[PDB]
Amino acid sequence: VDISTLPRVKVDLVKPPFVHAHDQVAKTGPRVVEFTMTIEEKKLVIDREGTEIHAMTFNGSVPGPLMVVHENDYVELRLINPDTNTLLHNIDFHAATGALGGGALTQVNPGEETTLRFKATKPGVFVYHCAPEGMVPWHVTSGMNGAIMVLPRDGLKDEKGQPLTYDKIYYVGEQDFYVPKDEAGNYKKYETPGEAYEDAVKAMRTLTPTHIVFNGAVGALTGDHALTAAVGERVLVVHSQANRDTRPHLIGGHGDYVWATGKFRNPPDLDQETWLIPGGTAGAAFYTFRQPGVYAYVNHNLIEAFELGAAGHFKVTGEWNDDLMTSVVKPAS
Amino acid sequence: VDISTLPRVKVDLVKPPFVHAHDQVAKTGPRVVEFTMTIEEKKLVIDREGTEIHAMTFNGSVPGPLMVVHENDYVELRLINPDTNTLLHNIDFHAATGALGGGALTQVNPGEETTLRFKATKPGVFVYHCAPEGMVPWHVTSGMNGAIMVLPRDGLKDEKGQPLTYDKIYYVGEQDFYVPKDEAGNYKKYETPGEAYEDAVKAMRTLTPTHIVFNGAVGALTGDHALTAAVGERVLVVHSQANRDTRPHLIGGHGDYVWATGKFRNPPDLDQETWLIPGGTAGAAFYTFRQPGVYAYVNHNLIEAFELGAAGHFKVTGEWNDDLMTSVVKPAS
Amino acid sequence: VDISTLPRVKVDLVKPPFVHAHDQVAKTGPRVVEFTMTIEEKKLVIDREGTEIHAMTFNGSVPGPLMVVHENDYVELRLINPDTNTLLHNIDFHAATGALGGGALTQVNPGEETTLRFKATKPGVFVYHCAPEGMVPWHVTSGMNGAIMVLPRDGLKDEKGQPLTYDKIYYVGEQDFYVPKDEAGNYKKYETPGEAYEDAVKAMRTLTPTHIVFNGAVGALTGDHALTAAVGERVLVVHSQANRDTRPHLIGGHGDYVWATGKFRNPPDLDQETWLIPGGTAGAAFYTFRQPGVYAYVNHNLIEAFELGAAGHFKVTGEWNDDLMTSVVKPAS
Ligand SMILES: O=N[O-]
Ligand SMILES: O=N[O-]
Ligand SMILES: O=N[O-]
Ligand SMILES: O=N[O-]
Ligand SMILES: O=N[O-]
Ligand SMILES: O=N[O-]
Ligand SMILES: [Cu+2]
Ligand SMILES: [Cu+2]
Ligand SMILES: [Cu+2]
Ligand SMILES: [Cu+2]
Ligand SMILES: [Cu+2]
Ligand SMILES: [Cu+2]
């Protein structure tokens, strides 16, 4: 096919956990879907203590933004590495086929840009991440990862082939950080990336994250940034982990339909309490809220959730159903 | 519905790995199934060395007892925290919907009780655990967790829709403990829970259990407490892990039908050697014994099994089948 | 049945990642398939630094060789422990039923041999490993493990029941090693196995591998030992991990059909980016190559891959498809 005969549509990305507007069921034939991302190296405070790291981001956030296309669209990414950055970067899409997912074709030094195109031949949610040869885990675990959703052209289906339509979608990126520590246990600090590299490697080799966070920091998805829904709304939560296993759980709810390893040609698992998303994968869970109130959304290694940071909240509006749950006798002497 | 028009049935719980009597296929319409549990803080010796911890239990055991109901029954739990305990506790059921699984409605100080009711709308095995705000992993990893089984009203089914009926059922709760260590590696000790809390947190944050045990102690499911079966018997083993991944394996057997993430509306996985139960989940495996003798039932991280405690035994009675396995030439020079 | 009336076929094993010749669809009725393995304790250099360990092998390799039979064949293994070895060994097949998978019947001291027969009643890929009572994880994590493939008699099938036929097969054994370290972090060394045992146990109990490798060493499946394919070829990659979870990923490709927990009566998962093989399991992934070039095949904990050793390469010959992927604008200022 002459790709130049296809429609082009430019997407304007949004910061996680929000997701750019899209159609679940494709309203057009295949398209070339145009995205641009600008790499930003920046300092980020990641915990309540004020611990500050040198993050490596796509488009200024950890995680990078969720990209959404349909199966057999073409993804055309302009990747910009401004001269205000100091490292070489690239991008690997797990959705793509060939050239290490794109990494072999997208190496950009500061002051360079590149444009990659690939055909999104398989439906699912997929990780994307930076992957410069010899320095891969350092870039990934500095926050340089996100996800892409490739919807089936006729949207999502349940285990019986009937439609599933979400009302809202959120993208939760989970990030394991490995902040080097001195022998006494305090975080070290470093003056340039090259002076940091050996201690970064040492810290990674412990296989013990110092922080595990959603949307780039402890508490990022709480308070005025809690996720929201109403009773009766259908919500899809896309969750990715580019480097390490996680086990998401909606405290007070379920995954009514879960693609734990993220690939929509497979039937979803029903009624999950918790599911395993392997490191290097994106998963997706569909839930219809039935009760109002505060929910916690966590990695259900509860240490990882409540001591290391892998916990967010939903605030859900609506009516309470006492048939589904009630306090018969409130706590009393 | 007026729940007061429904039958009430009081269950009398039993200590794991045994399971209270129940019917696989529901012999009545929906019921309110009444349970009572009394929280007990107690010292427990967990290994052969004599290491003693301050455990936090439901009904005196680690794990707490298995509760069994059918889909769309109501679970009505009276939870008692006697004044001989010193901490605040609550309960979260992963089977339930709303109020963080019940935790937001069941906070009981010593000397208090409460009664919670919820509708068991989804079939499967599910974790329950204590979850007091700000102290969640400490209570869970002190042993304060168990499981609940919500059977389909017409019992279990295989991947083709035909019945699966177990002859025996056992509940294996697997517990990761994080016993604080001094720099030399010996377990520390503490005089009150509040004096222990910071070191407990420190120990948890290593993400490295000091002990991983079945039924509350190294060797608990061995010797005179080994699990038992006969050749030809159909056995369901429910396995839960409230905080950390495990990978069960019957040494010498298989999981003929496994719901690794525990939810019975999904078809089981067939012929598993090993399966992954994510932390925060209950799973269930169905096996028909074909050979007599000693079996080991383990977490198949064999370090976790044989060095940290996650190993039990079956003793199986009956005839040996030499067609299925035989020593053709016994070991010899 | 009188097994003595069945055909006997002797297999001549090959060193991983290659696999002995076999038929996907069975060309005969059930057979007794005869294998012989000779245990070899040997020194192995496992990393680029020259770190040398005392490995425990089946047939001289880590992993041991892949054995291939069909469902309801009998596997008859002659296991030889020459008098040039110093330890007791045995074998457990996860494919087998009874006697701890064979371990209770195959204990051989140096200078002894034994012959075990079992019926391969369940199709799938399965782990085999040494398992001497009281010393199990030490033998396994010294490299004493491999896998066996039990093919359905009519070969592999997709999720719809139509045939899947591979053109090439490779066996990737992934090994976690626990090389004891001194307080400063250097690997220790030891003069006999018994003098090594306590420090080996200590090192294992950290649950933190020092090395995680494919085919027995860092870089073993790279360079002149890279895996190979051509565009359009259908490749099955069998992957095992006898002790610890892994999450394989073909960088630049997919698992088109994956049996993550290895058992062929289940439908495969489609279009996987990454899958979880639990410790104690073998899995298998089927892929049809669509692009030429270098691929990396990794455990997608990228620390485990690129810093600890769990990475190999494919070199794929053929035509580049610019419709599937192209650089629209190569990197430039
Ligand atoms: O289910 N909450 O930990
Ligand atoms: O890959 N499906 O969950
Ligand atoms: O299969 N037993 O380790
Ligand atoms: O959730 N089913 O295994
Ligand atoms: O997808 N490669 O890390
Ligand atoms: O066990 N089947 O992937
Ligand atoms: Cu980068
Ligand atoms: Cu990747
Ligand atoms: Cu408690
Ligand atoms: Cu929970
Ligand atoms: Cu051995
Ligand atoms: Cu085993």
Residue numbers in the entry:
A (entry chain A), B (entry chain A), C (entry chain A): 7 to 339
What do the authors of the reporting publication say about this deposited model?
Copper nitrite reductases (CuNiRs) found in fungi, bacteria and archaea belong to a highly conserved enzyme family that catalyze the one-electron reduction of nitrite to NO [NO2− + e− + 2H+ ⇆ NO + H2O]. The involvement of CuNiRs in two branches of the global nitrogen cycle, denitrification and nitrification, make them of critical environmental importance since N2O is a major by-product of denitrification, which is the third most significant greenhouse gas with a global warming potential 300 times that of CO2.3 The catalytic type 2 Cu centre (T2Cu) of CuNiR is located at the interface of two adjacent monomers and linked to the electron-donating T1Cu centre via a Cys–His bridge. Two invariant active site pocket residues AspCAT and HisCAT are involved in substrate-binding and catalysis and a conserved IleCAT residue provides steric control of ligand binding to the T2Cu. We have undertaken crystallographic studies at a higher temperature of 170 K (normal temperature for synchrotron X-ray data collection is 100 K) at atomic resolution (<1.20 Å) confirming the formation of a side on nitrosyl intermediate during catalysis in crystals and show by DFT calculations that the stability of the {CuNO}10 side-on form is governed by the protonation state of the histidine ligands in the catalytic pocket.
The MSOX series at 170 K, reported here, at atomic resolution is comparable with those determined at other temperatures, reproducing key mechanistic features including the orientation of nitrite and its bidentate mode of binding, changes to occupancy of the gatekeeper and proximal rotamer conformations of AspCAT and the formation of an NO intermediate, demonstrating the presence of side-on NO in crystals of CuNiR during an in situ turnover. The atomic resolution of these crystallographic data sets allowed us to deploy SHELXL for an unrestrained refinement and determine the structural details with sufficient accuracy to underpin the chemistry of the catalytic site during turnover. In dataset 1 (Ds1), clear electron density is apparent for a nitrite molecule bound to the catalytic type 2 Cu site in a highly asymmetric bidentate orientation with Cu–O2 and Cu–O1 (nitrite) bonds 1.88(3) and 2.51 Å, respectively with an occupancy of 0.75 nitrite. The Cu–N (nitrite) distance was 2.42(6) Å.
